[PDB]
Amino acid sequence: RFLKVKNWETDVVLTDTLHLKSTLETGCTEHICMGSIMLPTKDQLFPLAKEFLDQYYSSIKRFGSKAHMDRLEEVNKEIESTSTYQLKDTELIYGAKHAWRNASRCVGRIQWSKLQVFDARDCTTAHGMFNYICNHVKYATNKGNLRSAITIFPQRTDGKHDFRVWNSQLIRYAGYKQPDGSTLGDPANVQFTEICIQQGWKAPRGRFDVLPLLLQANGNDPELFQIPPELVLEVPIRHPKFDWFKDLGLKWYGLPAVSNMLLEIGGLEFSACPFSGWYMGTEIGVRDCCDNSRYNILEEVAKKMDLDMRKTSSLWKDQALVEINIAVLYSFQSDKVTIVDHHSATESFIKHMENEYRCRGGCPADWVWIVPPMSGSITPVFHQEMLNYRLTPSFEYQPDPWNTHVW
Amino acid sequence: RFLKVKNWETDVVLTDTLHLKSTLETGCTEHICMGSIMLPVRTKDQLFPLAKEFLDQYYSSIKRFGSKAHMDRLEEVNKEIESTSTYQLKDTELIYGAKHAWRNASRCVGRIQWSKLQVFDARDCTTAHGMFNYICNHVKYATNKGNLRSAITIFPQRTDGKHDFRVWNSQLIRYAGYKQPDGSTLGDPANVQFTEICIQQGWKAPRGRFDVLPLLLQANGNDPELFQIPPELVLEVPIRHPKFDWFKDLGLKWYGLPAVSNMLLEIGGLEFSACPFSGWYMGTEIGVRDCCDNSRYNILEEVAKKMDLDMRKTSSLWKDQALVEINIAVLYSFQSDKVTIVDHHSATESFIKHMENEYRCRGGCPADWVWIVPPMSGSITPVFHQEMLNYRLTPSFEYQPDPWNTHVWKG
Ligand code: HEM
Ligand code: HEM
Ligand SMILES: Cc1cc(N)nc(COc2cccc(OCCCN)c2)c1
Ligand SMILES: Cc1cc(N)nc(COc2cccc(OCCCN)c2)c1
Ligand SMILES: C[C@H](O)[C@H](O)[C@H]1CNc2nc(N)[nH]c(=O)c2N1
Ligand SMILES: C[C@H](O)[C@H](O)[C@H]1CNc2nc(N)[nH]c(=O)c2N1
Ligand SMILES: [Zn+2]
């Protein structure tokens, strides 16, 4: 019932009790582990509310108090009458920060308690959504000194009036099929780009076209808005020793902002909850730049470096990968845009894990996602056993809207 | 039931049905995933079902399921169990069993090779001296002057758990580690505890940085005995770099033969507690883990120093740069000495082709992502983007307690 995790580099053993509070399921059974799979009424709602409020009143050291009982009563009354309830500001803020705290795939959680929460529950139209989002972008960007933020649109009602941001991240590059057979821009975004074109977007058809936002209010048809170009901070990618690197013409955006997830707090579902922090370098340099299905630049870099590309065993891919990653970090640092390297981020996460075990009795973590996509075992997280389980409040995946929406 | 896995780079989707034959537990439940946890005397009552499951698999593999030969063998084994409480495998069954334990090893990236395994049947062995001779022969055969051949040697099975055959070494070839009074370590820090046992048992330690450890061998539940492997049988590779001439002066070398000796082979309910097996290295096992783990030879600093990298901040990626150079050196050295080695790109590419073949012909391939993905350059190998299913099939290799923790000393 009480589970141990061991770090194999330091011999440190921690005991997890927090997992006994887990509510959602993992995908795994006693016969099969699905650890590497990417995507595995009134009656239900009051239990979920009580569970949340119980944890909230516990957190402010007021469990079993008058105010605790009074709120449980109030929310009970409200669900009985209206079939839903509204969070107090304090509850919403606590809930958002805890969804981040519980995000088992996030290495950056040492930061969880410093999250600026923008309450957009008063929003009613797509134009309002656009206004809130520009404000979030500008606040979070802060001229390169990035601050973590989330903007929370109105909660699901009957599911026919959902707020959604159709974009997967607030800031991303277009992707286009070429008559050439190849792909121009970001190949991950071809489908969404086509939907944008279909909804009317005049596509520039370049390599780094920032996508417009496709916003849906109150379950209405989504509408198009261009983020003011002056609010989208981008960084030209250059290398501190290779003068030719800049001639590749690469750049990336400074603000990582996930917009397609669902925030569940005390049974309530917030289907539009864009959130942002700052990048870990490998996200851009390993994944964005080097994935086969992404910008896929390894061959070009290796050629300019004049590496022996004859045989895999010269490790030319590995050498080119490291240099691309050096260039990403150097370019962000030179332009003074917050970025963390994988060594510093994983060291921080180990400290955070130790804090959470000491202070909460555990930390759900998904090793498959926490370990960086390069140089795994020279980071301390590689040697750290982790237990993965689902706690609420939480961020969840949800179906892409174009499959769900009735026009 | 059907389970689908997706490759996120190629969009290829595979369907697993083989998981339906899984038996042993994973450690996970619907409430917790234990996928990154490293370590998650029978009754005749349990034994016959296990024997029968095995013999049914074996007889199906030779296209004789339900034949007279299959039935007679079931009968013969059943009678042996009720009369002697155990049974003996035929040579053919032992070979099939050992190959399949490798085929079923979900943490092994090298499984494309599973059908090419030389099986040495050491079930007639009775003494520690006998064990030493068997292991020397295995080492010489497998080494084959650098043209490495996979092999396993199988000592007598467990009887009552009081007469176990065991190789106390975790691997047949490993370097000693010595803790100094000032707290520093000479040699391999992973092997300090075991080195101390060897010394205690009477080994004369040369006390250098690369001393090949003696074998400590237990036959039939007796106290283990020390033996030195003839040095001429121990193939080693000096590590040098193709461009950096100062690399050789680090004084590094590694042995060519990776040979695991501390695992337990289960076939048809029988337990082979001494079953050393060997293949050839993937470069990262030496260049990433052995050379660069903080708790191993830990050479990253010295290498980056000699490369004159900016070491004042981690964000220069000096560790990553030195890491690649060290791995280049290991592959270069082995290749130059004509000692079999595979790089992590080649190995993972071959693993994906193997995995796809297994899905098509066998209905699945249990694989542990956490172990399959190499410890450097993860996402530029094809396994990183491959969804995998992890489950336990028998025959299998299993961990077992270290024998120094369980052995009853005779004196
Ligand atoms: C402050 C700096 C932050 C860093 C350095 C960071 C780091 C990361 C990284 C590297 C990942 C894996 C991303 C990938 O490989 O695609 C991740 C996942 C995630 N992070 Fe963060 N994070 C940060 C802030 C945040 C914030 C502010 C939130 C929410 C309030 C958050 C919630 C998540 C979630 C839910 C995931 C998993 C999402 C998914 O499954 O796709 N993180 N984080
Ligand atoms: C032929 C060349 C082979 C290569 C390149 C290879 C590759 C690997 C690698 C890289 C690992 C992970 C090692 C680690 O991180 O400690 C591994 C694990 C393993 N392989 Fe192999 N393998 C080979 C042959 C074999 C053979 C011959 C067997 C047994 C017959 C085998 C069974 C295993 C098992 C059971 C594990 C899990 C080990 C453990 O849990 O400690 N492999 N393989
Ligand atoms: C807030 C934040 C900061 C940061 N440095 N990185 C991230 C990236 O997190 C995500 C969020 C959503 C999706 C994602 O990619 C993989 C999921 C594809 N199905 C990755 C998010
Ligand atoms: C046969 C074989 C070939 C090859 N290339 N690599 C292996 C390594 O497998 C092992 C065996 C024993 C232990 C291990 O990892 C844990 C380290 C504890 N000594 C990993 C085995
Ligand atoms: C199949 C596998 O689950 C998939 O490639 C995962 C592996 N680990 C990851 N880790 C992070 N941080 N981000 C990812 O997108 C992935 N992809
Ligand atoms: C804690 C974690 O399970 C542990 O460090 C694992 C991770 N992946 C590994 N992968 C391989 N091949 N070998 C290992 O020893 C490990 N160690
Ligand atoms: Zn699992």
Side-chain angles (χ1 to χ4, degrees):
Chain A
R1 201 177 148 89
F2 314 126
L3 293 167
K4 285 175 159 27
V5 294
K6 174 170 176 174
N7 181 296
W8 288 83
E9 198 95 280
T10 65
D11 279 327
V12 167
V13 175
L14 301 169
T15 304
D16 189 290
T17 54
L18 183 65
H19 75 275
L20 299 169
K21 300 159 199 248
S22 87
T23 192
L24 313 155
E25 277 168 326
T26 59
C28 304
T29 76
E30 319 85 69
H31 294 257
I32 178 145
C33 176
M34 303 216 172
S36 68
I37 307 297
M38 280 211 60
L39 315 165
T41 354
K42 295 181 173 180
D43 301 0
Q44 305 134 119
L45 187 61
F46 188 66
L48 294 156
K50 173 164 194 305
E51 189 208 343
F52 171 75
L53 296 168
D54 279 7
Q55 76 172 74
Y56 172 78
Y57 279 84
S58 198
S59 70
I60 65 161
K61 304 132 285 182
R62 281 197 144 38
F63 190 94
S65 64
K66 186 218 199 309
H68 182 198
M69 296 308 97
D70 286 347
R71 165 108 273 232
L72 234 44
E73 175 78 348
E74 176 178 59
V75 172
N76 188 59
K77 285 186 194 300
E78 190 173 331
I79 295 164
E80 276 273 295
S81 157
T82 71
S83 78
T84 185
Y85 72 105
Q86 299 301 321
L87 295 174
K88 301 289 190 236
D89 291 359
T90 57
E91 297 164 2
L92 180 79
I93 294 162
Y94 172 94
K97 293 181 176 179
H98 278 73
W100 187 10
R101 196 179 194 177
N102 300 338
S104 75
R105 290 174 169 176
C106 183
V107 74
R109 280 178 278 170
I110 189 152
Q111 287 295 324
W112 76 269
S113 74
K114 303 195 309 306
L115 179 62
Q116 170 65 220
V117 176
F118 295 113
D119 186 350
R121 287 177 295 172
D122 74 359
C123 191
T124 65
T125 62
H127 274 92
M129 289 180 75
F130 177 58
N131 190 43
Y132 268 112
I133 287 161
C134 297
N135 288 351
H136 176 136
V137 177
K138 181 176 196 173
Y139 174 85
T141 301
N142 189 26
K143 293 154 187 244
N145 186 196
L146 306 202
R147 301 175 282 202
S148 296
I150 180 160
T151 298
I152 303 167
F153 295 103
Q155 76 208 32
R156 172 163 303 149
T157 44
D158 56 12
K160 272 193 159 196
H161 302 75
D162 285 2
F163 287 71
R164 290 298 301 265
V165 175
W166 284 38
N167 316 55
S168 63
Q169 294 182 31
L170 298 178
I171 302 168
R172 279 200 85 180
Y173 293 131
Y176 313 94
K177 289 199 323 294
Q178 296 286 249
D180 184 68
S182 61
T183 301
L184 180 69
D186 192 336
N189 298 325
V190 167
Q191 197 189 32
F192 179 79
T193 310
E194 276 179 306
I195 296 178
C196 289
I197 296 164
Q198 208 164 17
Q199 286 304 129
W201 187 55
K202 272 178 82 177
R205 294 197 79 99
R207 197 177 176 202
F208 293 111
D209 302 332
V210 173
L211 289 152
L213 297 162
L214 232 194
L215 314 175
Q216 163 187 330
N218 206 220
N220 287 315
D221 287 350
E223 299 179 36
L224 287 155
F225 302 94
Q226 175 179 4
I227 303 173
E230 71 273 40
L231 301 186
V232 186
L233 170 57
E234 291 180 299
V235 177
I237 307 298
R238 68 283 198 184
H239 191 279
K241 311 192 301 93
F242 299 137
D243 214 17
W244 47 261
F245 204 99
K246 61 164 180 279
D247 295 333
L248 297 177
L250 318 165
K251 68 176 150 165
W252 208 254
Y253 46 89
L255 189 73
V258 173
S259 55
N260 58 188
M261 299 191 79
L262 181 157
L263 166 62
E264 184 197 318
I265 297 163
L268 306 170
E269 297 180 311
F270 296 93
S271 42
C273 62
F275 61 82
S276 67
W278 55 80
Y279 266 120
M280 182 171 70
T282 50
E283 291 179 276
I284 304 161
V286 186
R287 307 304 314 282
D288 292 318
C289 290
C290 301
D291 277 5
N292 261 257
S293 57
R294 295 301 299 292
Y295 278 80
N296 184 214
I297 72 173
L298 277 174
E299 287 191 34
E300 305 166 73
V301 175
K303 275 157 143 72
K304 285 276 203 57
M305 291 177 76
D306 199 44
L307 305 176
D308 186 19
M309 291 169 77
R310 279 176 270 181
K311 2 144 289 150
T312 59
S313 63
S314 71
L315 310 194
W316 65 267
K317 285 195 164 148
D318 307 75
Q319 284 197 309
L321 184 65
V322 177
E323 303 298 342
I324 291 154
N325 280 273
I326 283 164
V328 167
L329 293 159
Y330 172 81
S331 298
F332 274 64
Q333 296 169 164
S334 304
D335 287 350
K336 219 82 42 45
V337 182
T338 308
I339 192 154
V340 65
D341 66 75
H342 52 290
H343 303 288
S344 178
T346 53
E347 188 201 5
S348 293
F349 184 74
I350 288 300
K351 196 186 185 200
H352 173 66
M353 264 192 85
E354 289 165 15
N355 291 331
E356 293 293 71
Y357 271 88
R358 191 171 44 79
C359 294
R360 206 187 181 201
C363 181
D366 178 343
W367 192 98
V368 174
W369 278 63
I370 299 291
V371 176
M374 74 182 286
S375 299
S377 71
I378 62 156
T379 69
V381 289
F382 179 92
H383 310 271
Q384 177 66 58
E385 285 179 351
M386 302 175 197
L387 289 170
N388 188 211
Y389 48 97
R390 316 253 280 150
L391 304 169
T392 191
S394 63
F395 295 109
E396 300 293 354
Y397 296 108
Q398 69 184 328
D400 288 323
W402 49 84
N403 309 324
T404 297
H405 191 64
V406 261
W407 288 88
Chain B
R1 205 195 288 108
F2 307 101
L3 292 166
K4 305 214 177 163
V5 301
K6 188 181 170 167
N7 186 297
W8 286 87
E9 174 194 346
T10 63
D11 285 341
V12 177
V13 180
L14 302 176
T15 293
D16 182 292
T17 51
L18 185 60
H19 69 269
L20 297 180
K21 303 305 183 207
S22 171
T23 38
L24 325 170
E25 65 150 55
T26 54
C28 302
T29 69
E30 288 96 309
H31 290 122
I32 202 145
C33 173
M34 305 230 308
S36 67
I37 306 308
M38 177 138 15
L39 309 169
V41 59
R42 263 191 172 96
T43 324
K44 40 213 166 200
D45 165 74
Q46 49 244 223
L47 192 44
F48 192 70
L50 296 170
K52 177 177 203 302
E53 187 211 339
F54 175 68
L55 294 174
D56 292 352
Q57 290 174 238
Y58 174 70
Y59 277 91
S60 301
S61 82
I62 62 163
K63 319 306 198 77
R64 301 288 186 274
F65 180 93
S67 67
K68 183 154 193 309
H70 179 194
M71 300 300 107
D72 287 353
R73 187 53 184 153
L74 290 186
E75 247 284 69
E76 179 180 58
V77 167
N78 186 232
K79 282 162 56 147
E80 197 173 333
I81 291 172
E82 53 137 291
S83 149
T84 76
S85 269
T86 187
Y87 74 105
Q88 299 294 316
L89 292 175
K90 302 294 222 206
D91 297 2
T92 46
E93 290 163 358
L94 184 75
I95 293 157
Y96 170 92
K99 287 181 190 194
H100 278 74
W102 184 12
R103 200 184 184 179
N104 297 336
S106 68
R107 293 179 165 175
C108 179
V109 71
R111 280 180 288 166
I112 196 168
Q113 288 290 328
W114 72 272
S115 62
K116 293 159 213 164
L117 176 58
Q118 179 63 214
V119 177
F120 293 115
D121 184 351
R123 293 170 298 166
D124 64 359
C125 187
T126 65
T127 65
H129 276 93
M131 298 179 66
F132 176 60
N133 191 52
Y134 267 114
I135 293 161
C136 285
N137 292 352
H138 175 143
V139 170
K140 195 170 189 190
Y141 173 89
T143 299
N144 190 28
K145 305 175 159 168
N147 187 193
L148 272 50
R149 302 183 277 197
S150 300
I152 177 158
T153 294
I154 304 171
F155 292 102
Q157 67 209 45
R158 178 165 293 150
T159 55
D160 60 1
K162 296 172 190 177
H163 293 83
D164 287 358
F165 285 71
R166 295 289 302 269
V167 175
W168 285 37
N169 312 61
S170 53
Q171 293 176 34
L172 301 179
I173 308 191
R174 281 211 80 159
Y175 299 124
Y178 310 95
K179 188 85 149 224
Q180 308 284 62
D182 71 8
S184 65
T185 303
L186 176 51
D188 189 339
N191 296 328
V192 173
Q193 187 188 12
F194 179 81
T195 301
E196 277 159 2
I197 298 178
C198 293
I199 294 160
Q200 217 217 123
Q201 297 312 300
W203 186 54
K204 318 302 171 219
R207 307 187 58 82
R209 187 154 70 137
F210 298 107
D211 304 334
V212 177
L213 284 161
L215 287 169
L216 194 44
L217 308 173
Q218 167 183 328
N220 205 223
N222 291 312
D223 291 355
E225 293 167 18
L226 279 172
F227 301 92
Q228 178 192 138
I229 302 174
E232 64 268 44
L233 263 42
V234 177
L235 182 51
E236 290 183 300
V237 182
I239 313 299
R240 61 281 194 188
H241 192 274
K243 313 166 177 279
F244 300 138
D245 193 54
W246 50 257
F247 201 103
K248 68 183 191 291
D249 305 303
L250 297 166
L252 313 168
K253 66 168 153 168
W254 206 258
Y255 47 88
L257 186 71
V260 174
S261 44
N262 62 357
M263 299 184 83
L264 180 152
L265 167 60
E266 177 185 329
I267 306 165
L270 307 175
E271 293 179 314
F272 297 93
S273 51
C275 64
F277 58 87
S278 63
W280 51 86
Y281 270 115
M282 184 171 76
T284 53
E285 298 179 77
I286 313 170
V288 186
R289 308 301 312 285
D290 294 327
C291 290
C292 297
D293 275 5
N294 296 145
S295 293
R296 301 291 310 290
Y297 279 85
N298 185 213
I299 71 173
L300 273 186
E301 287 207 354
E302 196 183 6
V303 174
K305 274 192 214 277
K306 293 291 198 341
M307 291 175 62
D308 197 43
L309 302 177
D310 188 348
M311 289 190 57
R312 306 163 317 188
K313 44 195 155 40
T314 62
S315 62
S316 70
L317 301 191
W318 65 266
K319 290 195 181 188
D320 312 70
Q321 277 195 313
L323 182 62
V324 180
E325 294 305 342
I326 285 150
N327 278 279
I328 284 166
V330 168
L331 290 161
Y332 175 68
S333 294
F334 271 64
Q335 290 168 177
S336 295
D337 286 353
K338 305 183 162 52
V339 180
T340 313
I341 196 164
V342 62
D343 72 71
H344 56 288
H345 302 293
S346 176
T348 50
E349 188 174 333
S350 289
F351 181 75
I352 287 294
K353 295 171 164 179
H354 168 70
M355 188 191 170
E356 290 171 352
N357 190 50
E358 294 280 84
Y359 267 81
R360 277 143 203 172
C361 83
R362 202 190 189 194
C365 178
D368 180 343
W369 194 102
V370 171
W371 276 62
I372 296 298
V373 175
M376 71 177 288
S377 303
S379 71
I380 60 155
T381 70
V383 289
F384 182 93
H385 315 269
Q386 184 62 60
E387 294 180 349
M388 294 174 201
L389 293 172
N390 194 204
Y391 50 88
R392 281 157 118 215
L393 300 174
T394 51
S396 59
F397 291 112
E398 301 301 340
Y399 293 110
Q400 59 184 331
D402 294 308
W404 49 86
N405 293 318
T406 57
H407 184 68
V408 176
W409 287 91
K410 311 212 167 176

